[PDB]
Structure 1
């Protein structure tokens, strides 16, 4: 299952300490994300060296013999007609011309730049590039010392200009500003000195080798794909939590349904959902709910839950397939020419072309928009009393609803999130211009597309944060609801006794106490125009009619007393249970307990109301930060403990 694969990505991200770059060992997207986000993670360039040295001396030797090789003794791009013997000045002229971005401050963040540096280092280990081993060591050192150039955000059609700033750093160009950690910014020469390095003078092919790859697009795509995998599993898992709070029917995930429509992502998401909902205590409440007035209640759930495994199927498959493609690019010699030193040949091709990453970045952005729409639809159902099977509108606790609009702000924001997200998911690759003196008449735009997918994922994180917060609210409302109904039942039953009401009367009134959604009358339980009293008055007329001629005047006396005793005691009992619940059980047997505990206990939150001074912002920000920084994976892995061994 893809579930176990993603769990494997998360463990690797958590547990990796050194990244081995040797030209043989695969770097996964988890390794890239770990390098970028965990500074205790070090790069270990393991000598591979022999290959690199053979390669660079072959290039240098051939260049000096005046051999005809692109970008070595030849001009660049549309300029391969021009030959030259000025080997080092050719290379330097290329870097000078590519330092051409502008700071608008918008920039490629250090995380992406350091990732790009790792990726360039990795490409070099295959021994096709002709770069000196010493330049590779310098990259390892810069990576391990938190040194990276400030890089302008835009300019690549995929990554000459952005990679030129890495080259600029290595050759100590004064105009190239370099970060050292989070605050320090110094010119390249000073940056090199602070970590015990000297500026390089570019040898044959070295300028081109440094700039002629897909490192930036693939770096952004790697962290994009790591996040997409985590958030995907998070979304699939939360569909189960949605089912629990919405009073869904868990049969939507029954294996036979998906066996007969066997998209792998359909089978696997449902298999997960079946396992999460098996023996659910909330599914117990659900079944009990639909057994009461069965023929007045929906036979099927709405699409946002029932159709989730079918919806998720292409999204799972897109995210998993894109991960393979991105990792293939990570572990590739993206460079040109390809030096075949064993067969004494330089091969001319186009491994700098980031089209594999570009196209898959477009697809993933559409899939991410699809995940967002799923969340939007679930969230929407949850806010509307007509679709939430007992829950209050906007998940407002009240009881005074005139001054508690619950999660309405979060609801409005969810539409704003989803709308921008859908917009973002238009393709980037359909916008290819004929570029660079029409030499680059196809170009992938992979970095631009990866940037937009990253932005889409930022929005997805907001939507997940809001959704999980709303569901924790719904858990609290469902647990309070169960407790409130039991209180109403007890008060009604004990008062039926005190007033000496017949058994026919007692059973009719107790049915009303069980059947009526408590949130429809919580605001004012003894309001005669609200559903509890309406139902009781209806049953009281029905009991008078059924017991007539089988003492009417005394019955009415006792029914009037029942109402008056209810008026003096019911509200207080309902208030007391709610005040108790608010001071601080079904979730305890649910597979979603780790999520509820995490949000409530570890993040320090509570059921939302007018009595809780924390704003919706303050609650959701906490959840969002924990999703953004990876802490959310702890309750996730706890939740999935034991799934498929």
Structure 2
């Protein structure tokens, strides 16, 4: 029942459990062995005063400075402190945990030549609930953020408790723990990695996929509410015509979500109803029936499908990175110490940047879907703005759309950060990834999307009441509707909406709608 951080199997979903659910983390005895053993071979090497970066030489540009092994502890200590210069807000408990969890798993791969105590210590914090106070800003892609974490391993820096930072020492005494003392290369192996962006990015992509599911969930409800066609979700057009993985998944998810609905119609019905409306004598015939529907309710598989692909690619990279020795230098039995740049988070930087873009478009789609039901000219017969009473006198959902519309614009002002490298440290770092910035951007767009989806969920439910097509809703649709109605009542007369939207946005955040679907239906969502 405990998460296994062996540095080879760790998954994104598992990182969330540890970060969010608090799942316990255990370092297999086999890993500790590879560590303890490797810690002995490496120690013997450094014990000869041999040139080894971050162990017997300066840091970064100062690699030209040779340090005698006599200052083994000071070298690693001065590093953690001098580099503990993070600024800005502190990371959320869950975020901070994902970060540490990613680092623990990094050194656990048995290539950082660290003592087991370090692995045990990190694990202790994750289990005993000792969350380090990690400043969001500082890493160039993740020295600063990781330096603040490492600081807590020696009884320094700050620990996060109730959103506020508290001296690590005072907290250790309260827990009875005795601060550790960094050893040969111990301080460098703790901060030198992509754990910051990998842990944060892990949570995002994980939740991103949940957001994708919840997007399809509400989209299905809306489709049934407006009585759209199902043809656009037939397997033939995807599994065959367009074999895009993500596209096929979305289409399949929609097909199941709308299973058993008396609202949705099939092409064979639209053409049947159309060929009958043309009852007119001949020629150019103007009909009130639409053989199809706007892209917002037709190209769902393609758009959300492309979003899924990006997410898959991200999870893949995130998976590989999680189980990789992002560190330097690296030790390898019967080999010279590896001196490269595995701390560089370009792969994750590019990934998160892509999630930001992908997520932005997911929000674009939802926003336009909201605009659809609110537009009397595009609502397919629904009252303008879903007003149940007297229009004009009541605005209905008119004011509820702006926050969603305003969000699409905001999300569009977030540009990729993985290409914004700036040379620092005597040019020694002439090319960086800025991965942590990319991960945070993705998190913002993700967060914003919840608020947009909140307006879409409320609108849908409202649409259901207005049209009075609840008894026509499918099994999954009914669950979605009720899941929303349980949080927010139908909009009869105009009223304060701010709280209503924040309420559903929170629910969507906790994957509350994806839940109601699993426990209320036999539906299995991809």
Instruction: Provide TM-score, normalisation by structure 1.
Output: 0.75
Kindly indicate whether the alpha-carbon contact (under 8 Å) linking 2:229 and 2:266 is maintained by their aligned counterparts in 1. Answer: no
- The C-alpha deviation readout for 1:313-349, integer Å capped at 9, x for no partner, is 2211111111111111111111111101x21431111
Alignment partner of 1:232 is 2:117: no
In the alignment, structure 1 segments of 5+ residues that lack a partner are 1-16, 483-584
Which of 166, 169, 183 is matched with 2:149 structurally? 166
Equivalence for 1:200 = 180
CA distance in 2, matches of 1:644, 1:373: 22
Alignment of 1:53 with 2:40, yes or no, is no
- What is the total number of aligned residue pairs between the two structures? 511
Equivalent position of 2:502 in the other structure: 621
What residue is the counterpart of 1:273 in the other structure? 254
Alignment of 1:470-485 (within 5 A): 470-479=459-468
Equivalent residue for 1:247, pick from 198, 221, 227: 227
Match of 2:417 among 428, 432, 435: 428
Per-residue Cα deviation, 1:580-610 (whole angstroms, up to 9, x for no partner): xxxxx223x4431111121123x2x322121
Give the 3-state SS of the residue equivalent to 2:290 in structure 1.
coil
Q: Give the SS at the match of 2:141.
A: coil
Q: How does 1:337-486 map to 2 (within 5 A)?
A: 337-340=329-332, 342-398=333-389, 400-424=390-414, 426-479=415-468
Structure 2: how far apart are the matches of 1:113 and 1:195? 19
Q: Residue deviations 1:516-566, cap 9 Å, x none?
A: xxxxxxxxxxxxxxxxxxxxxxxxxxxxxxxxxxxxxxxxxxxxxxxxxxx
Determine the structure 1 residue equivalent to 2:472. 586
2:258–2:477 contact (8 Å) kept in structure 1: no
The question of whether the paired residues in 2 share the 8 Å contact of 1:379 and 1:467 is answered with yes
Q: CA deviation at 1:183?
A: 6.1
CA distance in 2, matches of 1:607, 1:186: 45
Cα-Cα RMSD: 2.3
Inter-CA distance 389–590: structure 2 relative to 1 (3 Å threshold): farther
CA distance in 1, matches of 2:154, 2:259: 61
Please say if residues 217 and 480 of structure 2, whose CA atoms lie closer than 8 Å, have aligned partners that are also in contact.
no
Does 1:87 pair with 2:72? yes
Partner of 1:599 in structure 2?
484
Contact 1:404 1:609 survives alignment (8 Å): no
Q: CA deviation at 1:69?
A: 1.4
Pick one of 164, 168, 171 that aligns with 1:191: 171
Moved more, 89-98 or 356-365: 89-98
- Counterpart of 1:75 in structure 2 is 58
Tell me the CA shift for residue 261 of structure 1.
2.5
Say which SS state the counterpart of residue 243 (structure 2) adopts.
coil
**Match among 105, 118, 141 for residue 124 of structure 2:** 141
Change (3 A) 1:639 1:365: farther
CA distance in 1, matches of 2:144, 2:496: 45
Structure 1 CA distance for aligned equivalents of residues 289 and 150 of structure 2 = 67
Aligned to 1:98: 83
Deviates more, 1:327-336 or 1:628-637: 628-637
- Asked whether the 8 Å contact 1:593–1:639 carries over to 2, the reply is no
1:419-476, Cα deviation, whole Å (9 max, x unpaired): 111222x211221112221111111111011001000001011111111111011111
- In 2, the alpha carbon distance for the partners of 1:323 and 1:411 equals 32
CA 1:290–1:615: 2 relative to 1, 3 Å: farther
Q: Which of 285, 290, 294 pairs up with 1:298? A: 290
Task: Indicate the larger mover: 316-325 or 304-313.
Answer: 304-313
Task: Tell me if structure 2 keeps the 8 A contact 1:247–1:282.
Answer: yes
Using the TM superposition, name which of 257-266 and 118-127 deviates more: 257-266
Aligned counterparts of 1:238 and 1:193: Cα–Cα separation in 2? 50
- Change in Cα spacing, 1:213 to 1:629, as seen in structure 2 (3 Å) is same
Q: What are the Cα deviations for residues 215-251 of structure 1, in whole angstroms up to 9, with x where unaligned?
A: 1111110000111110111112332222211221211
Within the candidate set 508, 514, 518, 1:633 is matched to 514
Report what 1:43 is aligned to: 25
Give, in angstroms, the shift of residue 293 of structure 1. Answer: 5.5
Cα distance in structure 2, aligned partners of 1:615 and 1:290: 42
The structure carrying a bigger helix percent of its residues is 1
Residue 629 of structure 1 and its aligned partner are, at CA, apart by 2.3
**Bigger relative contact order, structure 1 or 2 (CA pairs below 8 A, ≥6 apart):** 2
Q: Measured at CA, do residues 644 and 371 of structure 1 come closer, stay the same or move farther in structure 2, by a change above 3 Å?
A: closer
For 2:123 and 2:460, how far apart are their aligned partners in 1? 45
Structure 2 residues without counterparts, runs of 5 or longer: 279-286
In structure 1, how many angstroms separate the alpha carbons of the residues matched to 2:422 and 2:439?
18
Query: SS of the residue aligned with 1:50?
Result: helix
Deviation at 1:284, TM superposition (A): 5.3
2:206 is equivalent to residue 325 of structure 1 = no
Q: In structure 1, what is the Cα distance between the partners aligned to 2:244 and 2:122?
A: 44
Distance in 2, Cα, partners of 1:415 & 1:121: 41
| Range that drifts further, 286-295 or 147-156 | 286-295
Contact kept in structure 2, 1:138 and 1:197, CA below 8 Å: no
CA distance in 2, matches of 1:642, 1:308: 19
Q: Secondary structure at the match of 1:147?
A: coil
In structure 2, C-alpha distance between the alignment counterparts of 1:153 and 1:268, rounded to whole Å: 35
Measured in 2, the distance between the counterparts of 1:314 and 1:284 equals 26
User: 1-side partners of 2:318 and 2:464: how far apart?
Assistant: 39
Equivalent in 16, 20, 32 of residue 15 of structure 2: 32
Separation in structure 2 between the aligned mates of residue 435 and residue 639 of structure 1, nearest angstrom: 55
Contact 1:305 1:378 in 2 (8 A): yes
The residue number in structure 1 matching 2:282 is none
Q: 1:594 touches 1:638 (CA, 8 Å); kept in 2?
A: no
In 2, the alpha carbon distance for the partners of 1:141 and 1:172 equals 14
Give the drift of 1:401. 1.7
Q: CA deviation at 1:58?
A: 2.2
Determine the C-alpha separation between the residues in 2 that align with 1:632 and 1:273.
15
TM-score by length of 2: 0.92
Question: Which of these two proteins has the greater Rg computed from alpha carbons?
Answer: 1
Change (3 A) 1:162 1:130: same
Contact 2:86 2:144 in 1 (8 A): yes
SS at match of 2:392: helix
Offset at residue 638 of structure 1 (A):
4.2
Counterpart CA distance in 1 for 2:205 and 2:524 is 23
**Does the residue aligned with 2:512 lie in a helix, a strand or coil?**
coil
